[PDB]
Amino acid sequence: KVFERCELARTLKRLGMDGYRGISLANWMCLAKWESGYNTRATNYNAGDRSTDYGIFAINSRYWCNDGKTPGAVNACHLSCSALLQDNIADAVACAKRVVRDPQGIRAWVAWRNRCQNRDVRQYVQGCGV
């Protein structure tokens, strides 16, 4: 499913993402926008290390979910990577929360550092009623 901006903002808010570990809803939106274009079916294979980024938050198989085909990978969110390809983003949100409980927080995603860190991200939530 490809979310429309405000639809996603409210969906994330209802799922408890606003201010989760200090991360604003606008930061989560900027992350999803640059990681998948709000596409829950987005996938990116990384030929270099044989891992795959899954879903709306492009969560990687080397550490976060299990797809059975990633060399020496772990599964910190304890989910099949298939759970990260559902139209319903509850499991993906649960996993994203797990990612940020680690030391780096939102910085875990390099894309956030590149496209969201120290940027004006107000535009992501304006007019969404969140």
Swiss-Prot record:
**Pfam families, alphabetically?**
Lys (PF00062)
Q: Which residues form the active site?
A: E35, D53
Its BP terms in the Gene Ontology are: antimicrobial humoral response; defense response to bacterium; defense response to Gram-negative bacterium; defense response to Gram-positive bacterium; inflammatory response; killing of cells of another organism
Reported EC number(s) for this entry are: 3.2.1.17
Instruction: Kindly list the GO molecular function terms attached to this UniProt entry.
Output: identical protein binding; lysozyme activity
Assigned GO CC terms: azurophil granule lumen; extracellular exosome; extracellular region; extracellular space; specific granule lumen; tertiary granule lumen
Q: Which UniProt keywords apply?
A: Amyloid, Amyloidosis, Antimicrobial, Bacteriolytic enzyme, Disease variant, Disulfide bond, Glycosidase, Hydrolase, Secreted, Signal
- Where does the protein end up? Secreted
- S-S pairs: C6-C128, C30-C116, C65-C81, C77-C95
Q: Provide the reaction this enzyme catalyses.
A: Hydrolysis of (1->4)-beta-linkages between N-acetylmuramic acid and N-acetyl-D-glucosamine residues in a peptidoglycan and between N-acetyl-D-glucosamine residues in chitodextrins
InterPro entries the record matches: Glyco_hydro_22 (IPR001916), Glyco_hydro_22_CS (IPR019799), Glyco_hydro_22_lys (IPR000974), Lysozyme-like_dom_sf (IPR023346)
Q: Does the keyword Secreted apply?
A: yes
Q: What residues does the C-type lysozyme domain cover?
A: 1-130
Do you know which Gene3D superfamilies this protein is assigned to? 1.10.530.10
Physiological role:
Lysozymes have primarily a bacteriolytic function; those in tissues and body fluids are associated with the monocyte-macrophage system and enhance the activity of immunoagents.
- What family is this protein classified in? Belongs to the glycosyl hydrolase 22 family.
Relay the record's extra comment: Lysozyme C is capable of both hydrolysis and transglycosylation; it also shows a slight esterase activity. It acts rapidly on both peptide-substituted and unsubstituted peptidoglycan, and slowly on chitin oligosaccharides.
- Known disease link: Amyloidosis, hereditary systemic 5: A form of hereditary systemic amyloidosis, a disorder characterized by amyloid deposition in multiple tissues resulting in a wide clinical spectrum. AMYLD5 primarily affects the viscera, and the predominant clinical features are renal dysfunction of varying severity, and intra-abdominal bleeding. Inheritance is autosomal dominant.
Give the record's subunit note.
Monomer.
- PANTHER family with a match to the protein in the record: LYSOZYME C
Q: What is this protein called?
A: Lysozyme C
* Organism per entry: Homo sapiens (Human)
Gene name of this polypeptide: LYZ
